[PDB]
């Protein structure tokens, strides 16, 4: 994995030694070169994971998250270069440094062979995210949002530290490859109950779990566009990655510990989606949609059937692409009206037709239109949870109604109807913005041709 | 109720609006033109019966029970004109009513496609921006203290002035673009 | 009572400016100024080349794989003859004639 | 489809409908005949005139605009303003 970590670190001299007008073009070019290089991780086998060293390996779960992560950096650089154009050159280089450093932490978070190194990188991802939100966020509430984002994650994860060090003392190792073969069944006790909670609640917060999700409609909304892209597209999916790693060590206790949390998700996706029907802030509507979509990933990991893991990792990759594009579309209208009120700018298909078509495609992938990998993940999770209990389809199916309802209302409020009269600074769509939308949507639609690469280690 | 100039509906205006709505809902009930013609003259006779009532209390009472009469006897799906609010073609072409300022954001390769149109548009924008300060100082010298009482706007007073707040009435899009 | 004289004067002035605008929406005879820019080809490019492509794809890539084009076997009647074999199917039993 | 109106055509059709009204003599009617003060018509008659204009040209005049049309010239001007004629 050292053929990826070293170019990501060489992106630091590539942004701090660049000419003052070349610091976006060079970082975009070489980050796209790293993203083209990321395809070598697709050397996956049906039996063995691509095991590099004592420190790094990459199975078919971590590989699509890595390719999405290394792809997301050029898209964040294209997204965040317009509103940081009047910024000081040193703070501009510091912003690019925080994005590069966050990618650097993420690519060795997903390839951590050992779990306490996973913890160190997993909590290392807080600090560039916290600095990006609380420094380049636009409104007043970025400080409070950074506080909530920091202290939900740390309060969930400092018991995870004690739990992982307890596994290191008990089993002898926190290598995942060793613990595939030295896993002991976890019996029923209160000690093993709080063992389970300490191993799970950090990732429950990072997914987020319903009831614990209060950081997210502040952290995703008060962030800048690159912060919202990396928080929605990757940093939620650390929780699903970590749960899929750590429920190896939590059997058969998960079979009766998952019962409340599944309820919290199966009801939570009914609530948060319903919250999306009454959100006046468009960016908050996309945030609660992200909560509603990650509730299915929580359910699928907690029922721990193969169809559920295949659908959950397909839903993670698909929601990363779709939610990143929806935040970028909301930014494309925020850079024209300078407000996030959804009812303010209306009728935008009369003025911006191709950008309305990008809104249309992002809304159709949001509502899981087949054969998108959104629908492949959604459908496979629904199959596995019908196998879990035959009544859950009601909570699934009603969700698939409400998920349609706000996905098109967002399309009807913003793009359709009569245009707002007094708003006259609606510029034509830049080539940069349509490039951003196309680089989100075209990989998402190409993955419908060959979806087996985003279906996880048990395809 | 809700009018831009008047703060209310007078009794005479309420009687006229009830008369128009009664004839329209009756015509919805009375599809054919001769049958509607007969019953519309009968309804005109009913309106011309109590025409000369001088007691405003008694007249308001008669208007109120006539509204009760109408609400009991209205068509459930009345006739609506196509471009009328509730019709089948109402606000249909609002997706083609592009505002004028979008023409300011064209590329020069498509502005040069219409040279006379934009060369004629520049003097519209010129006339607008040199009429603007005169009509603003017209509005702030004629409006009473405490704000304008009604939503009515004054006309132009001089020979050379344009009427105040005129641009989004003159340069509104056509109803069939 | 209709409009006040102020409202009549305003509607006349707005009417004049509106008709000037709508008349100035017309085109010039030179506008638009444009930049300086086989009978059965539809039977060839849209019928026949896709028939070629799809017949090659079915014949040498899809029929070469097992159970991809699975076809219902044709319907054998009493009185038929098999083309691959030549075995004539014997006809039905003689009818109890009804009418 | 949808033949474009003119001011002369709207004027001819408005005065055509008003000549077909038995409470108006077609030898006195001009474009500037006030209905209440020159033709002596009732307010109910003015409402019926506006409704015949609606049935003639195929669109609804609202009540706040119906009550302020007191001559055929203002009716022709209102239909001109709502149909954008002489474009």
């Amino acid at each position: 994995m050292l053929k990826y970590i070293i170019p990501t670190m060489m992106l630091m001299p590539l942004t701090w030694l660049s000419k003052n007008s070349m610091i976006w073009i060079n970082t975009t070019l070489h980050s796209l070169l790293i993203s083209l290089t990321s395809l070598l991780l697709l050397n996956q086998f049906g039996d063995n994971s691509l095991n590099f060293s004592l420190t790094f390996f990459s199975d078919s779960l971590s590989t699509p998250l890595l390719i999405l992560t290394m792809w997301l950096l050029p898209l964040m650089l294209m997204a965040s270069q317009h509103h940081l154009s009047k910024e000081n050159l040193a703070r501009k280089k510091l912003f690019i440094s925080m994005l590069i450093l966050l990618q650097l932490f993420l690519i060795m978070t997903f390839t951590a062979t050992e779990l306490i190194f996973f913890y160190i990188m997993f909590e290392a991802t807080l600090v560039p995210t916290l600095i990006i939100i609380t420094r380049w966020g636009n409104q007043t509430e970025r400080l409070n949002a950074g506080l909530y984002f920091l202290f939900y994650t740390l309060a969930g994860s400092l018991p995870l530290l004690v739990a992982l060090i307890y596994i290191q003392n008990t089993m002898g190792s926190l290598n995942f490859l060793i613990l595939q073969y030295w896993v002991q069944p976890m019996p029923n006790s209160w000690s093993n109950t709080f063992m389970w909670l300490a191993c799970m609640m950090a990732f429950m917060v990072k997914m987020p779990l319903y009831g614990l999700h209060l950081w997210l409609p502040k952290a995703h909304v008060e962030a800048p566009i690159a912060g919202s892209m990396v928080l929605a597209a990757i940093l939620l999916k650390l929780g699903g990655y970590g749960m899929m790693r750590i429920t190896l060590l939590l059997n058969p206790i998960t079979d009766f510990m998952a019962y409340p949390f599944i309820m919290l998700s199966l009801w939570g996706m009914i609530m948060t989606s319903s919250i999306c029907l009454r959100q006046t802030d468009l960016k908050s509507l996309i945030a609660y949609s992200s909560v509603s979509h990650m509730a299915l990933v929580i359910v699928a990991i907690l029922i721990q059937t193969p169809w559920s893991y295949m659908g959950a990792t397909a839903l993670m990759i698909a929601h990363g692409l779709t939610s990143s594009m929806l935040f970028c579309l909301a930014n494309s209208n925020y850079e024209r009206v300078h407000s996030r009120t959804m009812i303010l700018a209306r009728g935008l298909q009369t003025l911006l037709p191709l950008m309305a078509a990008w809104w249309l495609l992002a809304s159709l992938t949001n509502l899981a239109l087949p054969p998108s990998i959104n629908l492949i993940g959604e459908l496979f999770v629904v199959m596995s949870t019908f196998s879990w209990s035959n009544i859950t389809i009601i909570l699934m199916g009603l969700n698939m109604v409400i998920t349609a309802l706000y996905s098109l209302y967002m399309l009807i409020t913003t793009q359709r109807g009569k245009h707002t009269h007094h708003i006259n600074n609606i510029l034509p769509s830049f080539t940069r913005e349509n490039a951003l939308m196309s680089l989100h949507m075209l990989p998402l639609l190409l993955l419908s041709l060959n979806p087996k690469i985003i279906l996880g280690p048990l395809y | 109720a809700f009018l831009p100039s008047a703060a209310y509906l007078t009794h005479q205006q309420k009687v006229l609006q009830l008369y128009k709505r009664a004839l329209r809902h009756l015509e919805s009930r009375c599809v054919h033109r001769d049958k509607y013609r007969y019953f519309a003259c009968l309804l005109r006779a009913r309106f011309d019966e109590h025409k000369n009532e001088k007691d405003m209390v008694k007249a308001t009472q008669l208007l109120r029970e006539a509204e009760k009469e109408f609400w009991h006897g209205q068509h459930p799906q009345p006739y609506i004109f196509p471009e009328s609010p509730g019709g089948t073609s109402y606000e249909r072409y609002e997706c083609y009513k592009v505002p004028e300022w979008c023409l300011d954001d064209w590329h020069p390769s498509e502005k040069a496609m219409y040279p006379d149109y934009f060369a004629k548009r520049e003097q519209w924008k010129k006339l607008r921006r040199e009429s603007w300060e005169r009509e603003v100082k017209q509005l702030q010298e004629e409006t009473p203290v405490g704000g304008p009482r009604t939503e009515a706007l004054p006309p132009a007073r001089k020979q050379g002035d344009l009427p105040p707040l005129w641009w989004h009435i003159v340069t509104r899009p056509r109803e069939r673009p | 009572s209709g409009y006040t004289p102020d409202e009549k004067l305003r509607l006349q002035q707005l009417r004049e400016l509106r008709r000037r605008w709508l008349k100035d929406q017309e085109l010039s005879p030179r506008e638009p100024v444009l930049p300086p820019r086989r009978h059965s080809i539809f039977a060839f490019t849209h019928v026949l080349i896709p028939v070629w492509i799809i017949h090659y794809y079915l014949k040498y890539h899809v029929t070469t794989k097992p159970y991809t084009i699975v076809e219902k076997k044709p319907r054998i009647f009493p009185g038929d003859t098999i083309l691959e074999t030549g075995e004539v199917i014997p006809p039905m039993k003689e009818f109890p004639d009804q009418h | 489809d949808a033949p474009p109106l003119t001011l002369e055509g709207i004027k001819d059709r408005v005065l055509y409908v008003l000549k077909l009204y038995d409470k108006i003599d077609p030898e006195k009617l001009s474009v500037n005949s006030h209905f209440m003060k020159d033709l002596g018509l009732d307010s109910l008659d003015q409402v019926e005139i506006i409704m015949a204009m609606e049935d003639e040209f195929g669109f609804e005049i609202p009540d706040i605009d119906a009550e302020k049309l007191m001559c055929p010239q203002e009716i022709v001007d209102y239909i001109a303003d709502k149909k954008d004629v002489y474009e």
């Binding site: 009369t350 003025l351 911006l352 037709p353 034509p428 769509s429 830049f430 080539t431 | 592009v98 505002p99 004028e100 979008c102 023409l103 954001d105 064209w106 590329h107 390769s109 498509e110 219409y114 149109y117 899009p173 056509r174 673009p177 | 929406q25 017309e26 085109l27 | 474009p4 474009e87």
Partner: peptide, 13 residues
């Protein structure tokens, strides 16, 4: 013959 200018946004970009 009485061709009218169709106002539309900038489709160049």
């Amino acid at each position: 013959g009485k061709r009218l200018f169709i106002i539309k946004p900038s489709g160049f970009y």
